[PDB]
Design a protein around this ligand. Structure first.
Ligand SMILES: [Ca+2]
Ligand SMILES: [Ca+2]
Ligand SMILES: [Sr+2]
Ligand SMILES: [Zn+2]
Ligand SMILES: [Zn+2]
Lengths: 8, 164
């Protein structure tokens, strides 16, 4: 695999 | 790795169904339902797709809040870091959107991460979009809160290359 969304 | 997806990575029907399998306790259930509806509404305005909530795993897009290892071999990492992940359109696990339940989920101005903004991003993938290198695009890989309209040209350009 999935695409991931990352925080600062 | 060696895993491959099936298909061309876009939907080939216009009524996309979704199933909210569970909830973060951080917001009322209806507020979460609306946050997902609002995220879907961003994309339905600029595509020929409709998004219909269903109530079984028959759905194109299955939505799950998970902690750590939550069933797909791609574990979440606890507070902060990875916030969510999503699989491109197709059968089975494809299309699905998962959110890290170890996060504090908020809406705008809340002290946690915006469920609305994160869902809008994840759903972008669940429709077929890749990450953008445009820092202000919704599909940029890093979360930055904002109150301005989420979609940018690069996002609409990506989505239209998929659906017209
Ligand atoms: Ca996390
Ligand atoms: Ca939480
Ligand atoms: Sr699916
Ligand atoms: Zn992403
Ligand atoms: Zn997952």
């Amino acid at each position: 695999x999935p695409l991931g969304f990352a925080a600062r | 790795g060696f895993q491959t997806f099936e298909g061309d990575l876009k939907w080939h029907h216009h009524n996309i169904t979704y199933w909210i399998q569970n909830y973060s306790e951080d917001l009322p259930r209806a507020v979460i339902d609306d946050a997902f509806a609002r995220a879907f509404a961003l994309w339905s305005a600029v595509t020929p797709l409709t998004f219909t909530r269903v109530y079984s795993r028959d759905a194109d897009i299955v939505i799950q809040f998970g902690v750590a290892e939550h069933g797909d071999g791609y574990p979440f990492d606890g507070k902060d870091g990875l916030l969510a992940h999503a699989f491109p359109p197709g059968p089975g696990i494809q299309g699905d959107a998962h959110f890290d339940d170890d996060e504090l989920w908020s809406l705008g101005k809340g002290v946690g991460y915006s469920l609305f903004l994160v869902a809008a991003h994840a759903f972008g993938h669940a429709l077929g979009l890749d990450h953008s290198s445009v820092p202000e695009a919704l599909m940029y890989p890093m979360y930055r809160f904002t109150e301005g309209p989420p979609l940018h040209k690069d996002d609409v350009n990506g989505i239209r290359h998929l659906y017209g």
